[PDB]
Amino acid sequence: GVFMFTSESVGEGHPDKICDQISDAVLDAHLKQDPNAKVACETVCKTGMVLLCGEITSMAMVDYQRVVRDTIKHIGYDKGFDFKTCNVLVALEQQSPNEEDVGAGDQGLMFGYATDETEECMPLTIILAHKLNARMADLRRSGLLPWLRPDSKTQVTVQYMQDNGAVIPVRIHTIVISVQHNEDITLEEMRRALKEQVIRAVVPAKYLDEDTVYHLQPSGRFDAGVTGRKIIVDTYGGWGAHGGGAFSGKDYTKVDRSAAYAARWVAKSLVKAGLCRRVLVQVSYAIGVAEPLSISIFTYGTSQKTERELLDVVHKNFDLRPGVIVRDLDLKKPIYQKTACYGHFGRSEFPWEVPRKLVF
Amino acid sequence: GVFMFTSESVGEGHPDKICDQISDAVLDAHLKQDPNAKVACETVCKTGMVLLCGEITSMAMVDYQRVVRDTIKHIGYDDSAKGFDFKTCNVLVALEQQSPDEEDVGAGDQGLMFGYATDETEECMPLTIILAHKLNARMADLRRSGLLPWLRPDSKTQVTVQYMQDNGAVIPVRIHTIVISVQHNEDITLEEMRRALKEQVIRAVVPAKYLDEDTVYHLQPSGRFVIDAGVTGRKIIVDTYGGWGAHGGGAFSGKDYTKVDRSAAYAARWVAKSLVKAGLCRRVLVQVSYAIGVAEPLSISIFTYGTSQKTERELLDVVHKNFDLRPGVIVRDLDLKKPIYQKTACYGHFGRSEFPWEVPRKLVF
């Protein structure tokens, strides 16, 4: 069985991603001063205008204009947009103010996914898509490709072989890249650079061949942004499943974030321990109940051990009550801005990406 | 194994769904006058302010103010008391509309889509998302009939079903939890509202055999809800399978049929449902992938979760012989130039037998 699979990633300059990142920059700014901060921050933007909405309970003193403007500058708008001159409108309302046995705040359903097909225990499609966009960002920021601007979209299609439930990447079928740019640069120059400096640098040569299709700046030369609208890009690029919960601008008290991270942590640990090549972990929560209602492990036929055996391993090695997760994954730390682009999963610098040694 | 699964739906007055529904009303407005209109209409809304963004190529002459206001009125926001009113709200139209000047037309995007189906309900949809949707529709019915005139348009439901595995199929055993929050008038109490939600909404919609004395009810759980930011394309899971199957990422509303993310998502549903109704499997995830400027799918994968006697390859054979999933032919088979998109924008795009993608095709095999 040969199939093709496509995942997408968007650049830091994509308006939906501007909002995710700004929202998590505000979350971090509070956590730097007050780890017990509660933060629900929704960003909206529309060309020359950024609007922060939501609710905050915190003892931190956060200079919101500085945070937002610093984040816009960091993204690279200094292009249709500028940190020195854009309208930042801060609407959010800051009020002032068991432990491990506090019940879930929502009736949550979350999936965790891992695959052995990459070092990062992630689908090749989504990793390559995120890395291509990061490569462009690196080349733009360093001044090496000065014509690059921060908005971009990349799609990578990988042609796969099935292997009794596992999936083997065989070749790159198609890569699509569009990126915003300055005027003094040709179509041919941009395409040459994208092929040579971005794609060749990111994609293992063994996957590239003479039939790989390249759509580079496909519509020749180059809307509203909101927080929490790039949920497939943020997670597994179409692989596994998604319960619907967005991440950015939600603090650790939101099971949609904290338990999604933990679900990933479990799945990644199961693959790393050699108990399966591929796994979908499904964990459901009841409002006001600490203990999850259920945990389901699906190995796609790639485990010697049974589901129930794996479940017993999960119980022995993990405590997925929200309060314990926050502790074990150190989730009151100001680390969320970094998660808001290039995917929340696959990057080893996050604690949910450091596999737990399993005793079984 | 026993497991619990939760799906969410939101009512017509939830701000994200107000936007989806406005975006698709714009689409329909255009398609009534120009069957070939290209529409990419994004709606934003925040406290008395609706903003239409995006790009339309069309011959249609559309009164945007009227279409937006008719939609808001139809949703049921008709007075300042509700925090929103079709008369007094500002509809800020930012669209740039331009004017213009085959079965083997190429897909406009490098796209991946999933279709999913299951024998657990008559609609071939997961019970969790179907109940969630029907609970919201029931409230909307009782609000419009006058039977519960305290009801207002905005709402959110969650249904947790307890399931049993069955050789890859899933059998619903019971309703574990129901969460309902619905907007309301001032002169009704929480206690009356809860009773009515139990007796007139839940008992009417959810089959008696799934409810028991242990079923948990969280009805108006955050207390009162008398009176917020919305956009198009942020209820992608609510719109589809409610956590089940999988999702490639493509939002539907505000997009004409030439976006494969919409048209092939509907065909993929159609195929999945057709396979289950033919008796070929009890449960199926269909995955279809397209390449820009190529008509034919690159691949079609079919996972039956161990519920088919036929193999993947054999089921692929059946799909090849019964379906033509090129974008141009999809739109012909599913009548996708017809202006019925506003109807898809709440209560889910899948499960409702009034849509062509929900009428199974009789399969030769």
Author numbering:
A (entry chain A): 16 to 93, 97 to 115, 126 to 250, 258 to 395
B (entry chain B): 16 to 116, 127 to 252, 258 to 395
What does the paper say about this structure?
MAT enzymes (EC 2.5.1.6) catalyse the formation of S-adenosyl-l-methionine (SAMe) from methionine (Met) and adenosine triphosphate (ATP). MATα1 is a liver-specific enzyme that is mainly found in mature hepato­cytes, while MATα2 is expressed in extrahepatic tissues including kidney, brain and heart and also in developing liver cells. The catalytic MAT isoforms are biologically active only when they assemble as a dimer or a tetramer, as the functional active sites are formed at the dimer interface. SAMe is the principal methyl donor in the transmethylation processes of important cellular biomolecules, including DNA, RNA, proteins, neurotransmitters etc..
We report the first crystal structure of human apo MATα1, which was solved at 2.3 Å resolution, revealing a tetrameric assembly. The crystal belonged to space group C2, with 45% solvent content. Each MATα1 subunit consists of 395 residues, within which there are three major regions that are invisible in the electron-density maps of all subunits (chains A–D). The first region is the N-terminal region Met1–Glu15, which has been found to be missing in most reported MAT structures owing to its flexibility. The second region is the gating-loop region, Asp116–Glu127, which has also been found to be flexible in the E. coli MAT (eMAT), rat liver MAT (rMAT) and human MATα1/MATα2 structures. The last invisible region is the Phe250–Ala259 domain, which contains methionine-binding sites located at the dimer interface. In addition, the Asp94–Phe99 domain is absent in chains A and D of the present apo MATα1 structure. In the central region of the wild-type MATα1 dimer the MAT subunits interact through polar contacts, creating a salt bridge between Arg264 of one subunit and Glu57 of the other. Structural comparison of the active-site residues of the SAMe-bound structure and the present apo structure of MATα1 revealed an overall root-mean-square deviation (r.m.s.d.) of 0.687 Å. These two structures align well, except for the active site and the gating-loop regions that adopt the conformations observed in the SAMe-bound structure.
